[PDB]
């Protein structure tokens, strides 16, 4: 099991990640590890044999990121020197970016959209600081069909919409849904699914999160 | 064909040793690709731009890739690609003057919902009367939290746009009242965008009557120095 | 460092290590205060912070944690005319940086080596140092810090012709006995006594060729010429002109 | 007057000594983790009127001296080659040419100590 | 001035980690029904 | 077992930055316990390839032989379906197994 410390890295930070080894039993043992880095292309990057013996299962590594680098999903690829078939494998994207200091949730109302729901699909958005207090501010909510990896973007239901209180409400028409796609008979869409994009920008216009639920 | 399986042999011969060697001394870099390794890609650098000699010798097969990386002149525009911004800041016919902005979209078509992000100068403050002027319908919004503030601490503002235009310059104007009195005033900036890309935004700062929006520096090739107080 | 043996604590203090994250590359010599000599070319990086300094460390793998005292870099300085071909001007500075509350960085073991002002106050023939970290043979190793004595050689153009520069450069080898700093062993210091035995840098390790062959000479970046250089951004303090 | 966050070294922790808070007269003690020594004497920071005391303690990985193979026999493991430093962590594989067997430990790691966590294995014919 | 902090004794934050606290901790005190429980210092970042 | 981290110190006590905190850690007794502290951003931005305990259980259910959720078309297929061989003196005994995976 490969446990890497964050998600998403900087180019130019390390990255700390730990392999604990067990066997079938889930008990620690001492073994040899390889351990394979592997950028988004597939080429392997660097290559290691280390031990997890005196170790108590836990396994210490670290490993230095270049500073001119592609960025995209990275992996590490583990796998007991004894049987190189079983590879064990965890990601990690490297992308430059800024923490938002605040968190954007955008959730509907059910889990689904039944589609003769004439009221549509209703959705509410909850932003707030991480440290707990609430967002006031602006949010920019668009809809669109999901068919597959084909995405069609809804221009017709484009809101902008108060966010006050670290609350908003946003609906998407059932009108608006059906005049989006242009095919009247309302079954082909039974299989497809809904996503919402929600751009929540602050008062004092200096941080601005842009997220997104699918599915 | 049981004893051709038998002596069937595993896989060519992979072994190569690739020496970087250069006229000069540093450390000694050398390399041994092996079979169970041929797939590791081997990276060196070299800082110096500049024919070398690179000497392979051993059975197997290999591709050699030089690869510089370095940074390039840009012709095409850095900042403001994708949008037009031009600020004026006039005196007026205390110190009230009249600030100006007109944007326009570089697209094809019209831009959609877009956000103009105006600091105040230090000590100057929007007019409430001329805000609620501009927010009334005409493609504008500007929310109750910015119009509710005093003309004290109201030294930013936030203009929503339904849409610019991408044939002609969209032009607003309002007044800006001068509540603070400071030796240094420090220069305002107006930000223009569309909500679903921050990065293609265009930014002008505005100081009363100074060119353009930069402070006063000193520039010659690539090395600038601040030269923002008295000359002696 | 072909030849020679191996070096202990006490014997060469002004020894300076410079170690990236992969492996040790090179090294310098402390000229007092809070300043490095080393060779340009070894070095060039404008990502500077990185670079590391290691001082009295002697053997690579077990420290001895006493007195070991290594300091981060501040400012790196390289020569204007430095050229990346004929290896001409290759000198740069390096600036060691101490906390605040400090006024200097006080590196109580190195002892500082002097600058030699003029070409003349040494000969060719003279019994000359260079110690570093290189690979002796062909062989990795260069865990433990080598040094060995060489004689200065006058007229270099009859082993290496145009490439050599006598106003820039200095050649340093022995004839048969091969002894000659090589590979990893780069900008160290090429150290020589005088009367007094005071210990001056004549040379730091430039570019040279393939050591072993006594026909082809370890050639090593004069320190004397670049004097004035130095003066420049270090200032007049330390020894007397 | 409260000094600032002394920072944190690279596989290193530190604890504060003498109160609870970054004020003026405590001190801040250094450790390495588990196979990393601790380079220098200097190990602790002292918050004074003006700062914390020089620079930053640093951790570095312990190394073990680099193991050729034995007499009829090759080591084709390990990380990526030849002759050089094996820092904490790393394990080597010993197998001996065809016609001759293996006689002590088969894999060894670099230890705590520096050193390998086994002794350096022989080589010798195949003999029943 | 009157009744402020002067700038020289204003000591700016600096520690914005991602990620921190980085250590391991071995649960070696005696037992209470099977559990041992460990009291850890820490000091939070800026 | 179990292992559970929690404030080792009062609730009225509020997290200041800088300020030192005492950390409740109770777990079971001599295991070794590794910790990391995360900024709620990062997961504003990833929160993907996360350690949990489900994901542990799930890597060893899938690497589990059972086949089915139980019984089978025979006696033998019980035994084989639940990731047992069966094999008496007499010859009762459950068919050879040459696939590593389950049937589709
Ligand atoms: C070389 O230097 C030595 C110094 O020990 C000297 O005795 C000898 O005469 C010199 N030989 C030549 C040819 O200069
Ligand atoms: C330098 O002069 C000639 C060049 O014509 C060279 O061959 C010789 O080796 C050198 N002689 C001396 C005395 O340095
Ligand atoms: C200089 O070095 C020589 C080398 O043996 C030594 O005898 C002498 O004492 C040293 N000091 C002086 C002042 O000559």
């Given at each position: 099991?490969?446990?890497?410390d964050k998600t998403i890295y900087t180019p130019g930070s390390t990255v700390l990640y730990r392999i604990f080894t067990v066997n079938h039993k889930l008990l620690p043992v001492g073994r040899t590890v390889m ?102 501010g602006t949010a920019f909510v668009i809809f669109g069909i999901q068919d597959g990896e084909q995405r069609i973007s809804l221009p017709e239901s484009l809101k902008r919409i108060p966010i006050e209180d670290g ?49 | ?232 | ?241 | ?128 | ?46 | ?104």
């Open positions: 099991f490969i446990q890497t351990v394979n880095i592997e950028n988004p292309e597939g080429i392997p990057v660097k290559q290691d044999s280390l031990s997890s013996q005196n170790q108590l299962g836990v396994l210490p590594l670290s490993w230095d990121i270049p500073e001119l680098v592609n960025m995209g999903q990275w992996k590490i690829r583990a796998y007991y020197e004894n049987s190189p078939q079983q590879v064990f494998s965890t990601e990690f994207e490297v992308k430059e970016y800024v923490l938002p200091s605040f968190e954007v949730i955008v959730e509907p109302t059910e889990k689904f959209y039944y589609i003769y729901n004439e009221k549509g699909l209703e959705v509410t958005i909850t932003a707030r600081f991480l440290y707990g207090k609430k967002v006031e609350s908003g409400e946003v609906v998407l028409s059932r009108k608006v849904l059906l005049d989006g796609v242009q095919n009247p008979r309302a079954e082909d869409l039974v299989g497809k699914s809904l996503y919402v994009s929600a751009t929540v920008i602050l008062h004092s216009g200096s941080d601005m999160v842009q997220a997104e639920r699918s599915g | 064909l049981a004893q051709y399986q038998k002596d069937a042999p595993d896989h060519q011969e992979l072994n190569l040793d690739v020496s970087l060697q250069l006229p000069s001394r540093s450390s000694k870099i050398t390399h041994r690709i092996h079979w169970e390794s041929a797939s590791l890609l081997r990276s060196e650098e070299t800082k110096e731009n500049e024919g070398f000699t690179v000497t392979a010798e051993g059975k197997g097969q290999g591709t050699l890739s030089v690869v510089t990386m370095y940074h390039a002149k840009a012709k095409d525009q850095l900042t403001c690609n994708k949008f037009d911004l031009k600020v004026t800041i006039k005196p007026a016919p205390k110190n009230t003057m009249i600030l100006e902005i007109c944007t326009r979209y570089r697209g094809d078509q019209d831009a959609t919902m877009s956000i103009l992000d105006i600091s105040m100068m230090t000590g100057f403050a929007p007019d409430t009367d001329d805000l609620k002027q501009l927010a009334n319908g005409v493609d504008r919004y500007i929310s109750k939290y910015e119009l509710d503030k005093a003309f004290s601490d109201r030294n930013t503002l936030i203009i929503y746009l339904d849409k610019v235009s991408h044939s002609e310059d969209d032009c607003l104007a309002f007044k800006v009242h001068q509540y603070f009195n400071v030796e240094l005033i420090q220069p305002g900036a107006v930000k223009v965008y569309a909500y679903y890309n921050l990065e293609e935004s265009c930014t002008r700062f505005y100081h009363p009557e100074k060119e353009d929006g930069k402070l006063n520096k000193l520039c010659r090739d690539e090395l600038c120095r601040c030269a923002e107080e008295n000359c002696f | 460092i072909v030849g020679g043996k191996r070096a202990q604590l006490g014997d060469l203090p002004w020894q300076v290590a410079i170690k990236d994250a992969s492996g040790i590359t090179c090294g310098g010599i402390y000229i007092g205060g809070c300043w490095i000599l080393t060779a340009a070319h070894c070095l060039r990086a404008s990502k500077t912070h990185r670079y590391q300094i290691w001082t009295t460390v002697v053997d690579w793998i077990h420290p001895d944690l006493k007195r070991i005292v290594i300091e981060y870099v501040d400012r790196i300085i390289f020569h204007e005319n430095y050229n990346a071909g004929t290896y001409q001007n290759d000198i740069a500075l390096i600036e060691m940086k101490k906390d605040g509350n400090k006024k200097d960085c006080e590196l109580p073991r190195s002892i500082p080596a002097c600058v030699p002002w003029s070409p003349y106050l040494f000969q060719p023939n003279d019994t000359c140092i260079v110690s570093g970290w290189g690979r002796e043979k062909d062989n990795e190793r260069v865990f433990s810090l080598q040094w060995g004595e060489v004689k200065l050689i006058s007229n270099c153009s009859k082993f290496y012709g145009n490439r050599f520069y006598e106003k820039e450069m200095e050649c340093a080898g022995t004839y048969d006995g091969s002894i000659d700093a090589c590979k990893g062993d780069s900008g160290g210091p090429l150290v020589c006594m005088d009367a007094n035995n005071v210990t001056y840098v004549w040379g730091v390790v430039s570019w040279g060729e393939n050591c072993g062959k006594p026909e082809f000479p370890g050639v090593y970046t004069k320190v004397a010429n670049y004097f004035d250089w130095i003066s420049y951004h270090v200032g007049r303090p330390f020894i007397s002109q | 007057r409260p000094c600032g966050h002394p920072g944190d070294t690279p596989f290193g922790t530190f604890t504060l000594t003498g109160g609870n808070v970054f004020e003026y007269g405590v001190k801040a003690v250094y450790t390495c983790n588990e196979g990393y020594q601790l380079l220098g004497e200097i190990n602790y920071r002292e918050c004074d009127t003006d700062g914390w005391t020089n620079d930053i303690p640093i951790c570095e990985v312990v190394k073990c001296l680099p193991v050729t193979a034995p007499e009829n026999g090759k080591i084709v493991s390990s990380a990526m080659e030849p002759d050089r430093e094996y820092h904490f962590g790393q394990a080597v594989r010993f197998v001996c040419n065809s016609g001759y067997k293996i006689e002590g430990d088969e894999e060894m790691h670099c230890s705590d100590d520096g050193f390998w966590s086994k002794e350096k294995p022989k080589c010798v014919e195949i003999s029943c | 001035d009157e009744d402020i902090i002067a700038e020289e004794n204003i000591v700016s934050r600096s520690e914005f980690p991602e990620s921190w606290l980085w250590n391991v901790e071995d649960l070696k005190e005696p037992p209470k029904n099977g559990i041992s429980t460990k009291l850890m210092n820490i000091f939070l970042k800026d | 077992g179990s292992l559970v981290v929690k404030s080792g110190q009062s609730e009225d006590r509020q997290p200041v930055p800088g300020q030192q905190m005492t950390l409740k850690i109770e777990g079971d007794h001599g295991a070794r316990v590794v910790l990391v502290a995360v900024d709620k951003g990062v997961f504003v931005l990833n929160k993907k390839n996360k350690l949990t305990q489900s994901k542990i259980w799930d890597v060893v259910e899938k690497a589990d032989i059972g086949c089915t959720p139980g019984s089978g078309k025979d006696y033998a297929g019980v035994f084989s379906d639940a990731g047992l061989t069966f094999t008496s003196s007499s010859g009762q005994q459950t068919a050879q197994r040459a696939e590593l995976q389950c049937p589709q």
